[PDB]
């Protein structure tokens, strides 16, 4: 249900494991069924990120958010919605994850109640900000190179989640960027609760084995550090 209490971070750090994010134009298959078949395999928490060319839009984009929210409820797993704060209000989502050019966090942290509230940040002011403002957890990225999304910043490997945490900053961190099941333990080692994949997923020949094979690397790195 809604949250009457800010989620702690130990909660949270366990949601973001592993966190599968999709829109319909992330794939060539029935978008819904392979988020169904992401939840199956074993992803721990999912974004639904629709926007870009050949993205759905107007009520068409709603009833497709319907149908995963729907997916997400059968699956036991939190619903976060990407960028649009009105939607994630409508529809009772999870959460909400904005960016550097999105709304601002203080702003959003306000309009949403205790609802999970994630930023992206590129850089260490861009992180500490996003904890004074009410995030429950960053998105840092790009880890490794992507072109699922073509506006974003420079690469920069696991530096910024080492210096973050060298800090002595423990908000929960997700990776994001290029991660894929060969590259996600240096993400998890460098002191990530998680990473964060779209096509890894949404564009494998087996999204339900990928997803749990995701959920079985990410366990066993958390364990061993
Ligand atoms: C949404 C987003 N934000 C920063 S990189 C990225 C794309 C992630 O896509 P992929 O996992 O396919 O690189
Ligand atoms: C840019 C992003 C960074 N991190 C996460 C978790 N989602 C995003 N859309
Ligand atoms: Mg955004």
Same mark, same amino acid.
């Given at each position: ?47 639904? #990120?629709?926007?870009? /060319? +050949?993205?759905?839009? %107007?009520? @068409?984009?709603?009833?497709?958010? !319907?149908?995963? *929210? &729907? ?37 959003? #942290?306000?309009?949403? /109640? +205790?609802?999970?509230? %994630?930023? @992206?940040?590129?850089?260490?002011? !861009?992180?500490? *900000? &996003? ?46 960027? %290029? ?9 998890? *080692? &460098? ?35």
């Amino acid at each position: 249900g809604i949250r009457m209490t800010r989620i702690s971070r130990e909660m949270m750090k366990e949601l973001l494991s592993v966190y599968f994010i999709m829109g319909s134009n992330n794939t060539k298959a029935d978008p819904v069924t392979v988020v169904q078949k992401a939840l199956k395999g074993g992803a721990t928490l999912y974004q639904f #990120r629709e926007k870009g /060319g +050949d993205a759905l839009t %107007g009520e @068409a984009r709603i009833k497709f958010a !319907e149908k995963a *929210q &729907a997916a997400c409820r059968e699956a036991g797993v939190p619903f976060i919605v990407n960028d649009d704060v009105e939607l994630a209000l409508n529809l009772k989502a999870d959460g909400i994850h904005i960016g550097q050019e999105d709304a601002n966090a203080k702003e959003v #942290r306000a309009a949403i /109640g +205790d609802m999970i509230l %994630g930023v @992206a940040a590129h850089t260490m002011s !861009e992180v500490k *900000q &996003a904890e004074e403002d009410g995030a429950d957890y960053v998105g840092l990225g790009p880890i490794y190179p992507t072109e699922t999304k073509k506006d974003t910043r420079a690469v920069q490997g696991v530096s910024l989640i080492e210096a973050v945490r060298r800090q002595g900053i423990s908000i929960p961190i997700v990776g994001i960027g %290029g991660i894929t099941i060969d590259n996600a333990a240096p993400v998890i *080692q &460098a002191g990530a609760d998680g990473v964060s994949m779209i096509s890894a997923i949404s564009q494998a020949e087996d999204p339900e084995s990928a997803a749990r094979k995701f959920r079985e690397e990410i366990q066993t790195y958390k364990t061993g550090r």
